[PDB]
Amino acid sequence: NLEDHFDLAEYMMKMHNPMSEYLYWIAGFVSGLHGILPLLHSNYYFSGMFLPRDNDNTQLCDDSW
Amino acid sequence: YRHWHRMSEDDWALPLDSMPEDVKTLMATPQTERGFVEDYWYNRIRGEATLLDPEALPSKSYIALARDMGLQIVDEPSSHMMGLIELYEYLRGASFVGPFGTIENPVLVPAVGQERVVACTGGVGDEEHFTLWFRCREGFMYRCGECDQIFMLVRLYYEDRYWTQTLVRDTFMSDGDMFDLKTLERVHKMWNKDEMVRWEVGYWAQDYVLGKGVLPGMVEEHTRVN
Amino acid sequence: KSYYDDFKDRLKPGKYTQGRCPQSEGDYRQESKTIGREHLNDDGTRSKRYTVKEADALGYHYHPPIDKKGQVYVKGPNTVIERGQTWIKGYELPSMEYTYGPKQEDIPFYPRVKLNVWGN
Amino acid sequence: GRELPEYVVLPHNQQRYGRDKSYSYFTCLWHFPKMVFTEKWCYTNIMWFVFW
Amino acid sequence: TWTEIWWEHDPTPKVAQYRPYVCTVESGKVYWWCACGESKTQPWVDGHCKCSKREGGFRPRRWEPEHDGVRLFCGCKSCFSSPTWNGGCFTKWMQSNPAGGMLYCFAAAFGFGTLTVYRKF
Amino acid sequence: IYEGQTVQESELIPQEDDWVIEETNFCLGRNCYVRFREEDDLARRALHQMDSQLNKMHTRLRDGTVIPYMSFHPDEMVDRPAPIHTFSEKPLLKWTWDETYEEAYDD
Amino acid sequence: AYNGGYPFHYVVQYDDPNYDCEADFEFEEIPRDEFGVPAHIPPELSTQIRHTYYVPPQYYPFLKKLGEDTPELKPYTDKLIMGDMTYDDYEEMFYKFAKPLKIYRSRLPLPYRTDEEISQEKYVNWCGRWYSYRQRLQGDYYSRHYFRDWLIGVMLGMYLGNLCVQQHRQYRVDMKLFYLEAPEHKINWVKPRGDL
Amino acid sequence: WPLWCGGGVPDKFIKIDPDVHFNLQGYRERIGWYGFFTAFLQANYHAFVYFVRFIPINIAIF
Amino acid sequence: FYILVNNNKRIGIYYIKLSIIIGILGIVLSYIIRVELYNSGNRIIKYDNVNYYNMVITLHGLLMIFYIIMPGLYGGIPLYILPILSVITDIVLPRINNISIIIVLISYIVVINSIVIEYNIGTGWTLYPPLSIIGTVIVNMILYGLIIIGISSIISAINFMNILIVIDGIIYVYIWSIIITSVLLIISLPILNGILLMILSDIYFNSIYFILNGDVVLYQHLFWYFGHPEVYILILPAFGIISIILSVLNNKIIFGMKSMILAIIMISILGSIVWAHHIYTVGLELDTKIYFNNLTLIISIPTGNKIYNWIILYIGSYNILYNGYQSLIFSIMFIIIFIIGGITGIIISIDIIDIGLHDTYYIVSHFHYILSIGAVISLLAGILLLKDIIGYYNVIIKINKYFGLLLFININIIFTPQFIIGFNVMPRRILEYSDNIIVWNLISSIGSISTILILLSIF
């Protein structure tokens, strides 16, 4: 059939449902979260804060904020 | 061809259990209306009926003898088609090498469709260039942009069909006089008598014309267990 | 000149985001009921039944194409006999304006030149 | 062997589909959540997956 | 020197100028460049030169800018990037006045040598 | 190394004094994204795509022969975008040699 | 010369008319070959024995007619009549009379070209030769120009490299004077800090 | 075998008609749930044949 | 269907799609690293969570090498065009091709799941023992991923080798590039599997190979016997692409085709015998060091021949053709960038220079210029060349001079300063550093944030 000639015919003929694209981007977004979420979780687990304050592991001036 | 695998047993002959049981209608069917199995057994029954009648062979012309065996007398039209068919089949698993193409004699590119991908490598020796691929569509005399080698597409097309051995046989072969069942019976009695069958195909064929199970031992031959 | 103005008429701006109405206003997920379109959805995409649930490669809707004589339909060439010779007229593709839109005029000239090869 | 017409006239007169409307960079930020919570085929597939 | 000593079957232009012509050009407009060097509306074809009359293998050279701006155009009529200028006007001049070419090249190399040596040293 | 086809001076001699090099444009035309009609369905948009293939285009010379779209590699010979099944009929790479046999000729 | 001499397909005969090599499990029946040689006579011996085809004498007049109509075929038919045709003789006869299929170029439809176009064939060939002449000459011209230019790059890369050679040269001179004259070099200066 | 060593089966003795063997449209309704279980079990005859030949030696080792 | 498809061209698309997805995780990890290194102090990782940084650098390396660039250059472009270049209908082993991509995805899920569930610790992507064998279960999970990935790589290599049996045309340079990478995989992977099994034995089976009286340097030999062939398994497909692009876009036949092919074969043989240039500082024997240093410098000869053959491909091309296409720019940029990476490789090849530059950010910049810049750009250039054939859209890349310029400038801002800090010296695989190295680290960090922003403009 003419519809079956091209692989991924709906996408190539520009008729595909946009949800397929959204899922692909969502999947990539979830993959990215696997580097950020465990960072926050591990920081809180061993420190009690989700993220540090720059240079809070060193001596700071009295007025430092 | 080198690309084909090993001959099957069927490539030599078919089992007699594949003979159509309605022999009377089989021998009356026109060639264009006979299928592959029906055409095999029409030719074998009729061809062996004439070959197993020695006294009539010397008086039979080659035109009539070829018709009985089912062989097609060759002519330029059919030879052209068959030749281009076999050339197409050979090129399926073989290299494509030949003389340099010119306007007088273009490179012949056989195809079934309306297009076939072709590459030009130029001439021989220093005139050979890198592969230049192009799509050879029908109805255009192609010229390589580099060496000016002329190409042309040849289509194996005839009347809404492509060219096959079956198509060539149907289009050019003409059915002769209708096969006479009396000849089958006469030859049958010649080589099959007193429990000796020296024409097994004609013993089975005569049995079917008689209605299946009539001749001695044929009911036992047709009784199977699985 | 502006070549976009030549085919502006063909390009009518769209109404729906992503070219589909809300499924409530029209259910594009269902198979079309139009005769001869049982393999397509309402929006024109191939139906899951045709491609997945009842795919022919899995044994559904078994229909051998080849006929008894081992033949399939083939469309012949455009043959034109002339000057004591049978000719075939090749099929020329439509004007690129029809398929792409720009009007095929004022095309820059790119001459034929054989391959640029290093010599000596 | 099946016989079909050259064209068919549909019973409805709704032009449901067509060219995309012009979209901006962040159009997806509202269109995607709209599909999830408003298109049946999307939220029935999500609930089915979560439940099982 | 392709036309001069190697190949005698291509048209050979006349040098209008051994310097590029500076012109303001607009995107979406097509310009026609003189390839014979005899037009009086340089760098464009005037309708009376060889290019306009399609004489002796001379034809106008079509050109169109992508963006608006000021572009340099070939006056020597032999630049590799013609109609645009890439320095071939100076190169062709050196072929015609090799003594002058050496003077400029020495001066350019002298400046380049001094600056690069002064900074690195 | 390849340096073009060899030419004999006899082949460079014209049959008329006005012969020059044919000025045929080998720019196929002006193109852009293939533009589908909204009215066309999936089947008819497939036909549209198949009719916009640059590799099916050619340039016809003064003698009626056409120089086709050519490429160094067969990757540019399939329809764009690539269909599921491309080379159903095996592409033929034509080699040339000087060998001949008598059966091919007739006196 | 293929498969060790074993034919892919061969005929086997059995004396008992109701014998089945798959159903029966008896141990007395000896199979025969196509010529009828019992299996217990080894191939090396049976292949030496000369086997010839015997047709019924009623066929002799037909085989005679074939020889006369085709004199090249007569010697083979005579062998068959006289019972001197082996399998090898039959094979020689078979392949001797096999002919290749013929293709006629005069029957091929041609791509459409007008009579005006057909008269321009010499002109187009003439243009092609001049294009090949110009191509070949340009190859020599370009090869000379660009490979010569690459020398400018060598010289530019030799100048820029020499700049770092001079810097390195001065560096080594400076290093030799550090421990000898430089006041930056200090001895009996650093004292141990000690543990904190 | 339907390979070089053998060939096709005569029509008189064919028992699996492809027209009926294929065309699985709504086959689950025709076979029912127990039929579905039967078909799954019968689809693994090849794997069953192997396990019947493989297990004994492993029992001996054990 | 989607997962059941055996089409070789569809599977090629899957490989590119998955490489981009997994690539998002890779780039995110890179941003974490550069953010942390912006100054001295703790910025986004606590001092009590320093183990996370060690895991970030480990996963970054492993994912980018085995789950992104290798699946993209050896799985993606190859599976889509190789059967077409070979004028064959489809790939020789259809079912094997399907399982290979599924295997890659399953091993990726295992790795990322191990981030979420296991304690986060790191031992580098080179998994040196004894550190690798005294760690927690996350190391066990990573080992399973590598072994599973190895299965996919070897079966894919078998698939490509079978093209020699079916190729109906001429073996083009690109086809030669993939075949040789396949050979390199068939010979190197079995050795890797063995040493990985020994790491498992010590982790999980109470083996003692990597404790006293057992030589830990043994692992480094077997690992790098696969390690360096891996870097050429990742670059050779890129070379094959560069050859096609330059010839096609410049309309020039490849010059010295046989020398290109024989250069690829040579690089492979030499690359299979130079692994110990990664082990210069362990204390190997003088003659061994001299052998490996000598043979390592030889690899430049065949690699140099290919570079110069590419240059002449671009030289002399017609001026009328527009040269601003992204694919052409990337192909040219590869030559300019690869020379930088290779030359620095020759510098580090001298062992005495290497003593100073081992385990410093100079090594980082060296292999980034080749992989993070050269290999990435080659994959982009190859996909861009096949845009019409592949058929993807909804991106502005094909003609985007801004993207190319911004990428080139900013990528160099990241890694050029890493060459400087190599003589400062700033060790690798560290997060805290002395205050006098902030300037260069800060400049590179500004480069990383900028490159990420440019990745958003393509959409």
Ligand SMILES: CCCCCCCCCCCCCCCCCC(=O)OC[C@H](COP(=O)([O-])OCC(O)COP(=O)([O-])OC[C@@H](COC(=O)CCCCCCCCCCCCCCCCC)OC(=O)CCCCCCCCCCCCCCCCC)OC(=O)CCCCCCCCCCCCCCCCC
């Ligand atoms: C490096 C980046 C930058 C790169 C730049 C350079 C790029 C250069 C160009 C490269 C080009 C490469 C080649 C491209 C070829 C494209 C071919 C193509 O389009 O094929 C057609 C193919 C399919 O089209 P089709 O043929 O119409 O398919 C029809 C379907 O088969 C059938 O349709 P259907 O509707 O029936 O479909 C079924 C559907 C049914 O779907 C639905 O029903 C969906 C319903 C809505 C759901 C929406 C998501 C909801 C999420 C909720 C989250 C809640 C979180 C709450 C948190 C709370 C916290 C408090 O889906 C499913 O049922 C399964 C979906 C599974 C996949 C999605 C998975 C998502 C992530 C899951 C994570 C799970 C983690 C678990 C962890 C557990 C731990 C314990 O297209 C796609 O799949 C889309 C591709 C789109 C991109 C193409 C490339 C474009 C160019 C590049 C753009 C840049 C991309 C950058 C990367 C992404 C960045 C983010």
Ligand code: HEA
């Ligand atoms: C694809 C990636 C890739 C490529 C191609 C290379 C190529 C080379 N690499 Fe590699 N290298 C890596 C990836 C790569 N490398 C990685 C990822 C590491 C670190 C792994 C880790 O430690 O964790 C590494 C580490 C590494 C080290 C370790 C340094 C250290 O541990 O302290 C060394 C030193 O020998 C080295 C050398 C080389 C050499 C000599 C080449 C040669 O191939 C370069 C050849 C190219 C040229 C030489 C330029 C082109 C040729 C010419 C221009 C000809 C003229 C030039 C000359 C005559 C010299 N590399």
Ligand code: HEA
């Ligand atoms: C090919 C693999 C690869 C790639 C692309 C990169 C890309 C980058 N890497 Fe790389 N990196 C490694 C492999 C890679 N790296 C390895 C193997 C190590 C050593 C691990 C270890 O020490 O144990 C390492 C280490 C490493 C460190 C050292 C941390 C440390 O150990 O102390 C740092 C930060 O300085 C860093 C930064 C970056 C940055 C900023 C980018 C890039 O973000 C730069 C910007 C470029 C882009 C954002 C484009 C990338 C896009 C893609 C990859 C997708 C391509 C897909 C298609 C084209 C379909 N890397």
Ligand SMILES: [O-][O-]
């Ligand atoms: O590793 O080079």
Ligand SMILES: [Cu+2]
């Ligand atoms: Cu190495």
Ligand SMILES: [K+]
């Ligand atoms: K820090």
Ligand SMILES: [Zn+2]
């Ligand atoms: Zn040619």
Ligand SMILES: [Zn+2]
């Ligand atoms: Zn003029």
Ligand SMILES: [Zn+2]
């Ligand atoms: Zn000029």
